[PDB]
Amino acid sequence: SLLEFGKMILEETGKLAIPSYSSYGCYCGWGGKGTPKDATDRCCFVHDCCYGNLPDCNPKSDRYKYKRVNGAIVCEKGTSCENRICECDKAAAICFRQNLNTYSKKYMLYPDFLCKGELKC
C-alpha cells in the first residue's frame, strides 16, 4: 500500500513522498502520459509499468511487510500480490536513491500539457 511505499522512499532518499514525488514530472504521482522528463521520472514510469503487470492486485491499498537487512530492502512472504507489489516498490525506492543527484525542483507540480507523447511499457 501507499503506506509502505512512502516509508520506503523516506528511508531511502530522506525526502517525503508527498510532495517530493506525488507530483513530479509526467509519471510521478497521478496519471501517466508523455515522455519521462528525467531519470527520476523514468523511475516512476517503470514503477507505473510494474504495477501494470499486476492487473488483479491493488497496489495502493494492499499492505505488505518488508524488513531491512542492514541497508537492504527485503520483502517478506505474504500473498502473491503482496510479494510482487513489494518488489515493484523496492525497485522504485532504489531507483530514486540512485538518481537523487539529478532530482530537479523545476519538475515538481509539472503542468499536464507539457507531457507530450506515448511510450509503451
Binding site: 511505499f5 512512502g6 508527498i18 514525488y21 510521478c28 497521478w30
Partner: peptide
C-alpha cells in the same frame, strides 16, 4: 503516511 506516488 505521506505517499500517493
Amino acid at each position: 503516511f505521506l505517499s500517493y506516488k
